[PDB]
Write a protein that binds this ligand. Structure first.
Ligand SMILES: Nc1ncnc2c1ncn2[C@@H]1O[C@H](COP(=O)(O)OP(=O)(O)OP(=O)(O)O)[C@@H](O)[C@H]1O
Ligand SMILES: Nc1ncnc2c1ncn2[C@@H]1O[C@H](COP(=O)(O)OP(=O)(O)O)[C@@H](O)[C@H]1O
Ligand code: SF4
Ligand code: SF4
Ligand SMILES: [Mg+2]
Ligand SMILES: [Mg+2]
Lengths: 576, 222, 255, 122
RNA sequence: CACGCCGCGGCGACGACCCAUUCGAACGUCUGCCCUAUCAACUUUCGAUGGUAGUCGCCGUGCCUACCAUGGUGACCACGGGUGACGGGGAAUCAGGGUUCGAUUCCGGAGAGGGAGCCUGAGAAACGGCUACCACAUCCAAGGAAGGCAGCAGGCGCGCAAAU
RNA sequence: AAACUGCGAAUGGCUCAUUAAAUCAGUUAUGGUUCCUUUGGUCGCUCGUACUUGGAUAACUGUGGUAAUUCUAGAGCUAAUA
């Protein structure tokens, strides 16, 4: 049974004129435990959130009716679809797929959004919340009885609707993929189109490098190609804006809608949600306590389902799930294919540097030569002291738990206090410190690897890509983590980002990577935040815009009334 | 912007006209008045162009009768512009812009009234021949200047149609309002039914007049 | 209801169509036609339930669009066309002819007529008026409008028409002493010779009949259809010949 | 094993013969309709796939089975007059499966466009 | 469509001024409705009853306008109020009498959130039509756009109480 | 295929909120009115280019606006039981 909570709005609740009938009618007040505390000298009633029993007595006893009853989510075990193990995560509901349109799934991380894909694609038979004695496919098809899906799963069981997924963990694919991009992509096409899939995804300039050659941006866009040529009907796109810049995110969004025949089944799952208005037609939402249970809501429309989620209150249920709305010279590397000619630029202490790049522009080569590796030109600065370095792709190899790995292999004599209250307590790795690092998903893997790179003392922090594999909620948490750490440690740091809202917030100083994308590159002298974004967004020819109330960066339509009047003045984003 | 159309050859082009001192002969004149188009360039010397409508800054169309710079809401119907009804008799209230031109349009559609001396590089170098030529009897005999004993069926305009992978063919429209013997047979049938109907009327009138005199013999005998 | 109705449920149908309760929710509504809605047989009932030439409702349509069935010598493509009370339903592929005649229980019978007999029918003349430079008209009970009648014909008479032409061959005058059939109310289907008419100003007139058995009844004047002259019927009759036997003699005849 | 045919109507309008089958099979299961078609086609001097049977209900107790059967004049009158599910029971016919809900979504999506676009909006 | 006869033609689908009758609809007659007097007097010359002449309507008429008459209903319960009141065919009890129930699959009425006002049409005061006002709500580039499950399923909420 | 045209969308469905001589029921009337459709009547009754007449607009082609709709604007064609 859902927990119900009494909810007061601020308007039409003027407490001086209506004689405080809500407090005097409540049963919990009439023992003396104060769920309601009002006075006639006040501006609002305050109903307590853990002392309300949710019994609905206070609602009818109000003169200017302002009091609503609102569900708060709980463990329900009502129409459970799949539970993974003993004392483990429980996926309650199944999403409904639809022909010929795109389905988006937004929410938090660790809530079950990839597990929903594996059940709808034939990759799992769910055990219906019963892990000892799993029911088999006959009795699964009598539990979705009276729904559409016991026809749809019958198409899965005889393979009348073929299901191919794009994997969430995109960095690990060349371990089962050997050779060249020309051979491994083109032997498995099974439709010889070969013409739109590269030009919509900016490819055939990467086709004689190896599959092991690519950095994480180009590693991502290869996998979007390998699902799209294939002949099937059911496609699931796991986090397709991971490791990508904004210009390639729109091209990935357009090609997903080029996979629509009206008989094809496309659902996607996003955490970026500024191309989601250009990417999907209907959006389901996943609430719950993270990794204890997750439930799928009903599908809402594109513009509708976002603004429902950003307030965090679902209107088709009455459920509320959230109340919150010093000098280095320039050099040439050429690894094997193309050079990056850095222009010699200045450098500071106790300031922040943000790399603004493209898919193959040289960000993960410039963060290596600051650690003193791969230096074929004479000169280039060596730092005096040891350096912290985060890798792009963390393929971990460890022993046992993270309490051996974090707490007794780096700073065994700890730096708490003060280490944990400033850094570790918002980063929330004390809950997952019991679990081993080898079973981890990509959200916790990225979150645990930052803890060492902040936890190491060094002079220059090489930090790259914190906005991979995380949700939208803990991406502004990382910003106050890094801003309050290095400007109170008085050291400086290299931060490397793809996301627009993260890179705008921190940046003291800006390093721009100009030139032709992935064929000849130049890293410019360090510019300011105002001209640095407004030059770089003139290289995208893409203009951003704040939604005025939840501060969300939204992208203008390409030739529009807002876009050409912003590209005229060159303010590609106001107040950077 | 300007959407310039040439009605004589049927080609149109879309240009970006960016300075607004260039456009001062366009402003404060209503729709469907010819303007002196010498002033937005050097290639327009004898061409005068007709202002045949356009769209708002926000995309709503302009109507001829509406007389302001700004926007109104009008109750449109079947036969009106800027409207297409769903049902017979549906009326919806829509927002349009006036017929007055000002600088706050997004497109100003222009139709060249009379050709000047020069050539404009997309409009006056090519013609498209008008597809789907005339189908009635008199538009053929009026176009090709035929006479009272002349045969309409021999001068119909043919469509040559060629396709890669198909055998070539010539295809002609079905001529309507053409007096074939089927039409004359139908008229002869209708005049025959007139003949049968009046034949019926007068034979039943004589038959009933005979029967009524025979009955009034029987009724006068009391 | 903001207009005309187009459907008719099964339990609100006439009782004399003898429908089931569980075959479906709806009954066929008769089309607008010559005959009234409570007093007619559609063709889909007459071919599906009485004669069993077609089992389901699509096969009655497959019969009728092949131009097989004649109603009064005219080819009828509507499957819900109303017919009743000496419409001559004629099927020429099998050479049968049917005349719709009430049997004495009050139901439309399958009653077969001779192929020489199916060139005429009888019609009760309901309205006599003049028009349009003195043309006398005549309106039958199946709404045939005939110009130039015999000038002795008056209301509530029976004429006999030729089914090829539409013209009056001879007529019967309404009297005592003519044989009669009821198209009517509680005494529907009984055949007897007329003994009386009580004439009331302003209301329905009651006509007393005496049967071939001698038991007597009376009905309203709008329910009396004269079959023949004298005690001679002009049509083929059903096999009971209109004598209502009681439930005792009907059980004894079924014994 | 034993076919008896109850009330027989030869039907010159739809070109068939109409009868009610009695099947006595006192030691066996309900006999297949193919064997009934072979026995009745051996009975009525005709070929076995111009005759169509349906609706056989086995009575309570192991006794007779009673249903309908109709014997057509030729196969072309069968392809005109017989219902398409009853021809599709014989392999003479097959329906294209979408069947009802994808057609309805394609009907409500082809209302949103105009012109030649209704063909290239699926 | 059928095809010709020595000009003249057969069989049809479609069409309409009109008349008939066919589905009806609309307005009327006589008689019948549960509780209350702590509702015995009501109705008004701006319509309450009637007369004349019109307007209007599809037609009859205070339906409405002008002028004139002072009427109309009432303990045989008007008028006012209540109703967890849609009306009827019917239902459960039942010796005869009664008493109570009927939202509910058939008929008849009414309404599509509250009220209005209209377009087309033979037929509407239509809401799987439109125009506003009130009320509540969705998207927005804050310039604007679109709304109506008391249709089938479904979720919210209220609940003792109702399905894929 | 599309679009023009014609017809249907006023029946069916759902619920019972208003309504206590109102609804409704049996009864009687339209001699005080309308009626798409079907079915029969009528359609050389009239004493005054015709071997067939005119103008367009859709589908289509072509240029675009708007963030946004089953929004539609300009240019060029061609029909009718419009
Ligand atoms: N082992 C290798 N052999 C040959 N070429 C390589 C190899 N490794 C990298 N490259 C090339 O050098 C370039 C280096 O890529 P870079 O590190 O700039 O990408 P990135 O900055 O990580 O991209 P993003 O940051 O968008 O994920 C790539 O374009 C790649 O083609
Ligand atoms: N085999 C398993 N054992 C334990 N937990 C599992 C297993 N499979 C899935 N889970 C849990 O299910 C959740 C799935 O998360 P995920 O689908 O990655 O969400 P998202 O992709 O939206 O971040 C995780 O929190 C994980 O703990
Ligand atoms: S909720 Fe109660 S206390 Fe608050 S304003 Fe209303 S009546 Fe007063
Ligand atoms: S829900 Fe219950 S406890 Fe909470 S305010 Fe209302 S009456 Fe009080
Ligand atoms: Mg995922
Ligand atoms: Mg990278």
């Amino acid at each position: 049974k859902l927990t119900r909570i009494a909810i007061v709005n601020h308007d039409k609740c003027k407490p001086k004129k209506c004689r405080q009938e809500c407090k005097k009618s409540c049963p919990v007040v009439r023992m003396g435990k104060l769920c309601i505390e009002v006075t006639p000298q006040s501006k609002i009633a305050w109903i307590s959130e853990t002392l309300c029993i949710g019994c609905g007595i206070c609602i009818k006893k109000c003169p200017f009716g302002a009091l609503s009853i609102v569900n708060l989510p709980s463990n329900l075990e009502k129409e459970t679809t799949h539970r993974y193990c003993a004392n483990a995560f429980k996926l309650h509901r199944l999403p409904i797929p639809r022909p010929g349109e795109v389905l988006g799934l937004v929410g938090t991380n660790g809530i079950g959004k990839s597990t929903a894909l594996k059940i709808l694609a034939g990759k799992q038979k769910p055990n219906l919340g019963k892990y000892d004695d799993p029911p088999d496919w006959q009795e699964i098809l009598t539990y979705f009885r009276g729904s559409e899906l016991q026809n749809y799963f019958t198409k899965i069981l005889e393979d009348d609707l073929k299901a191919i997924i794009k994997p969430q963990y995109v960095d690990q694919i060349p371990k089962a993929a050997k050779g060249t991009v020309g051979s491994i992509l083109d032997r498995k096409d099974e439709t010889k189109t070969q013409a739109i899939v590269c030009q919509q995804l900016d490819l055939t300039h990467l086709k004689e490098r190896n599959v092991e050659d690519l950095s994480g941006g180009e590693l991502q866009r290869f996998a979007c190609a390998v699902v799209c040529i294939q002949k099937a009907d059911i496609f699931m796109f796991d986090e397709p804006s991971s490791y990508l810049d904004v210009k390639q995110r729109l091209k990935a969004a357009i090609t997903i809608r080029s996979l629509i025949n009206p008989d094809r089944y496309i659902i996607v799952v996003e955490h970026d949600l500024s191309v989601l208005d250009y990417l999907s037609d209907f959006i389901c939402c996943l609430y719950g306590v993270p990794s204890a249970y997750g439930v799928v809501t009903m599908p809402f429309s594109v513009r509708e389902g976002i603004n429902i989620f950003l307030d965090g209150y679902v209107p088709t249920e009455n459920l509320r799930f959230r109340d919150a709305s010093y000098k280095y010279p320039g050099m040439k590397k050429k690894m094997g294919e193309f050079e990056l000619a850095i222009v010699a630029g200045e450098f500071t202490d106790s300031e922040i540097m943000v790399m603004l790049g493209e898919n193959g522009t040289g960000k993960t080569t410039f963060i290596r030569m600051l650690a003193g590796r791969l230096k074929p030109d004479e000169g280039g600065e060596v730092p005096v002291l040891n350096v912290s370095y985060k890798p792009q792709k963390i393929s971990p190899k460890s022993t046992g738990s993270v309490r051996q790995l974090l707490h007794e292999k780096i700073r065994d004599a700890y730096t708490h206090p003060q280490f944990v209250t400033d850094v570790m307590k918002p980063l929330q790795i004390e809950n997952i410190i019991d679990q081993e690092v080898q079973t981890l998903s990509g959200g916790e893997l990225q979150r645990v690897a930052l803890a060492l790179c902040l936890g190491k003392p060094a002079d220059v922090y090489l930090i790259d890509e914190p906005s991979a594999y995380l949700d939208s909620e803990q991406r502004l948490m990382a910003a106050r983590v890094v801003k309050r750490f290095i400007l109170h440690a008085k050291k400086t740091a290299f931060v490397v980002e793809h996301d627009f809202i993260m890179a705008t917030y921190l940046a003291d100083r800006v390093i721009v990577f100009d030139g032709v994308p992935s064929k000849n590159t130049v890293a410019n002298s360090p510019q300011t935040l105002l001209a640095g974004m407004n030059k770089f967004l003139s290289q995208l020819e893409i203009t951003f815009r704040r939604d005025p109330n939840n501060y969300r960066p939204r992208i203008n339509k390409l030739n529009s009334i807002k876009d050409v009047e912003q590209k005229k003045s060159g303010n590609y984003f106001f107040l950077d | 912007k300007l959407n310039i159309s040439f009605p004589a050859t049927g080609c149109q082009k879309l240009i970006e006209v960016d300075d607004e001192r260039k456009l001062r002969t366009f402003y404060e004149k209503r729709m469907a008045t010819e303007v002196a188009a010498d002033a937005l360039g050097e290639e327009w010397k004898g061409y005068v162009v007709r202002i045949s409508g356009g769209n708002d800054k926000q995309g709503f169309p302009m109507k001829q009768g509406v007389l302001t710079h700004g926007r109104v809401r009008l109750l449109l119907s079947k036969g009106h512009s800027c409207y297409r009804p769903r049902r017979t008799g549906e009326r919806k209230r829509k927002s349009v812009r006036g017929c007055i031109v000002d600088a706050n349009l997004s497109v100003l559609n222009l139709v060249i009234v009379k050709k000047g001396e020069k050539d404009i590089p997309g409009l006056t170098d090519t013609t498209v021949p008008r597809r789907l030529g005339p189908k009635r009897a008199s538009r053929i005999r009026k176009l090709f200047n035929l006479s009272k004993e002349d045969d309409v069926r021999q001068y119909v305009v043919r469509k040559p149609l060629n396709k890669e992978g198909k055998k070539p063919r010539t295809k002609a429209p079905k001529i309507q309002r053409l007096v074939t013997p089927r039409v004359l047979q139908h008229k002869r049938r209708r005049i025959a039914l007139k003949k049968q109907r009046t034949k019926k009327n007068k034979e039943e009138a004589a038959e009933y007049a005979k029967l009524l005199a025979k009955r009034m013999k029987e009724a006068k005998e009391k | 209801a903001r207009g005309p109705k187009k459907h008719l449920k099964r339990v609100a149908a006439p009782k004399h169509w003898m429908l089931d309760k569980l075959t479906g929710v709806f009954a066929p509504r008769p089309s607008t036609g010559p005959h009234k809605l409570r007093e007619c047989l559609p063709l889909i009932i007459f071919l599906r339930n009485r004669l069993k030439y077609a089992l389901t409702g699509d096969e009655v349509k497959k019969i009728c669009m092949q131009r097989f069935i004649k109603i009064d010598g005219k080819v009828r493509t509507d499957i819900t066309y109303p017919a009743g009370f000496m419409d001559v339903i004629s099927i020429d592929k099998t050479g049968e002819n049917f005349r719709l005649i009430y049997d004495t229980k009050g139901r439309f019978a399958v009653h077969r007529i001779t192929p020489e007999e199916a060139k005429y029918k009888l019609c009760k003349v309901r309205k006599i008026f003049v028009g349009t430079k003195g043309i006398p008209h005549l309106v039958t009970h199946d709404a045939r409008t005939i110009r130039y009648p015999d000038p002795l014909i008056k209301v509530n008479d029976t004429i006999q028409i030729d089914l090829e032409t539409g013209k009056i061959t001879d007529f019967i005058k309404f009297d005592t002493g003519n044989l009669c059939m009821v198209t009517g109310g509680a005494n529907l289907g009984r055949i007897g010779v007329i003994t009386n008419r009580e004439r009331h100003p302003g209301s329905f007139d009651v006509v007393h009949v005496k049967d071939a058995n001698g038991n007597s009844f009376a009905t309203r004047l709008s329910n009396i259809f004269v079959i023949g002259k004298g005690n001679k019927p002009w049509i083929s009759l059903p096999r009971g010949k209109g004598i209502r036997l009681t439930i005792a003699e009907e059980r004894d005849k079924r014994l | 094993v034993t076919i008896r045919t109850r009330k027989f109507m030869t039907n010159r309008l739809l070109q068939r013969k109409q009868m009610v089958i009695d099947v006595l099979h006192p030691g066996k299961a309900t006999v297949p309709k193919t064997e009934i078609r072979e026995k009745l086609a051996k009975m009525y001097k005709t070929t076995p796939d111009v005759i169509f049977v349906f609706g056989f209900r086995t009575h309570f107790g192991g006794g007779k089975t009673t249903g309908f059967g109709m014997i057509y004049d030729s196969l072309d009158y069968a392809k005109k007059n017989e219902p398409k599910h009853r021809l599709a029971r014989h392999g003479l016919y097959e329906k294209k499966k979408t069947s009802r809900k994808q057609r309805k979504e394609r009907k409500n999506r082809m209302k949103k466009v105009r012109g030649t676009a209704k063909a290239n909006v699926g």
